[PDB]
């Protein structure tokens, strides 16, 4: 398999760029037909259940895609089962001879290594998990148990399992001695960074996907251009302006990607506009990136506007420290922002205590409040202090 599940979810929701609906519909009927996985062609009906812009035409004629038939049938199913049942007969025939011989621990472990990849390519999920239990007892060195972690990670990316896959990811990477081995630490900067996008982390994910080595090519799982795209996602949250001009802008890893593919408009247009603190050029790059980056990606569109709210409050905080008192009409004619839309932008933050700002509507001016105060820091310790005392009192009375 390639990319695991991406093209299947590209047709879930698309706001603009209808031409991508045809390419995404032709890819899902290509790779699945070329690969050996029987059931993954059937799941196309269950994935789009209760969704807007469904690409499945059965009882719903509202499909806007050019190819409206994803539905499972028996024509492709019979063709895929003939190739799956023929190869499993040859694999079980050769491996059974090695089980009775029992010569060395390599042939016993390698027999289940080819199976762990085979049961994943024939569409067996729970059956492939049982193959790891037999290969675990046949493991030789620490590297043999690492291949078990790959099977858990590969099979866990289909349904995006953040519990068993994420927990067993750090268990294999630790074991007794962690070390600087490339089969663990490098995969820790990739597999663990994927789970941070589903749990809305943006902190620990910025310490791996952003600052790392120059390759991290996983082939079938992820590519180089895919991982480099998320570098600008988590890099705009934790990393301040000091690290944006070093590990993002001036980093040589992202300099070669800008001159190669200019259609991203994320690591370049958004970073230059944010570094210059110019809202005039910062606005048009928000809609272009949201449409062609956040929406198509599976780990982004799940956030989408949730991630957009974090980018807007970043530029409003930078300009807030650049002046004390400024007229509302002066800023409207400077950065090219409307007066009506200005009240709605600041209305989703100030009442939430995200940004401290004062606006006088009599003279039409905006002021600057104190960004950091001693009492504002102690208010956070009230919830953290009472949050701990709640567990000590509740769990203390439970065990008695």
């Amino acid at each position: 398999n390639y990319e695991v599940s991406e093209k299947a979810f590209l047709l879930t929701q698309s706001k603009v760029s209808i031409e991508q609906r045809k390419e995404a519909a032709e890819f899902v009927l290509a790779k699945i037909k070329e690969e050996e996985m029987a059931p993954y062609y059937k799941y196309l009906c269950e994935e789009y259940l209760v969704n807007n812009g469904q690409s499945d035409l059965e009882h719903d004629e509202k499909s806007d895609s050019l190819n409206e038939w994803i539905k499972f049938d028996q024509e492709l199913y019979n063709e895929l089962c003939k190739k799956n049942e023929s190869k499993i007969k040859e694999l079980n025939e050769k491996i059974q001879k090695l089980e009775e011989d029992d010569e060395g621990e390599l042939e016993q472990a390698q027999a289940w290594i080819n199976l762990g990849e085979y049961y994943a390519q024939i569409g067996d999920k729970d059956n492939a998990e049982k193959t790891l239990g037999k290969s675990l007892s046949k493991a030789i060195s620490t590297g043999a148990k690492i291949d078990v972690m790959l099977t858990i990670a590969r099979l866990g990316f289909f349904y995006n399992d953040q519990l068993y896959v994420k927990e067993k990811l750090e268990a294999v990477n630790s074991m007794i001695e962690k070390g600087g081995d490339w089969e663990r630490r490098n995969r820790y900067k990739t597999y663990y960074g994927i789970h941070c996008l589903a749990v809305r982390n943006f902190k620990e994910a910025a310490k791996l996907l952003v600052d790392s080595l120059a390759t991290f090519t996983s082939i079938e799982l992820t590519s180089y251009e895919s991982i480099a795209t998320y570098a600008s996602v988590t890099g705009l949250f934790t990393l301040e302006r000091t690290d944006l001009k070093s590990k993002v802008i001036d980093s040589p890893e992202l300099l070669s990607l800008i001159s190669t593919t200019a259609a991203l408009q994320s690591i370049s247009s958004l970073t230059i506009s944010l570094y210059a603190s110019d809202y005039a050029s910062y606005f048009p790059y928000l809609l272009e990136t949201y449409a062609n980056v956040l929406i198509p990606c599976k780990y982004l569109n799940r956030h989408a506007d949730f991630f957009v709210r974090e980018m807007r409050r970043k530029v409003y905080a930078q300009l807030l420290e650049s002046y004390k008192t400024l007229s509302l009409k002066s800023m409207a004619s400077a950065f090219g922002v409307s007066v009506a839309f200005l009240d709605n932008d600041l209305g989703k933050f100030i009442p939430n205590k995200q940004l401290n700002c004062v606006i006088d509507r009599v003279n039409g001016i905006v002021e600057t409040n104190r960004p950091d105060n001693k009492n504002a820091q102690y208010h956070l310790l009230v919830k953290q202090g009472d949050g701990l005392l709640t567990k000590l009192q509740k769990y203390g009375a439970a065990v008695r």
């Binding site: 606005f283 048009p284 809609l287 506007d305 949730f306 957009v308 709210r309 922002v337 409307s338 839309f341």
Partner: peptide, 27 residues
């Protein structure tokens, strides 16, 4: 999910593109 995922957003969709209308006319 504090003050974010519960109320979602439900804004800044068609109003974001509408901002370019007043920018390319009054100017």
């Amino acid at each position: 999910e504090n003050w974010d995922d519960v109320e979602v957003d439900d804004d800044f969709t068609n109003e974001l593109k509408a901002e370019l209308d007043r920018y390319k006319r009054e100017n």
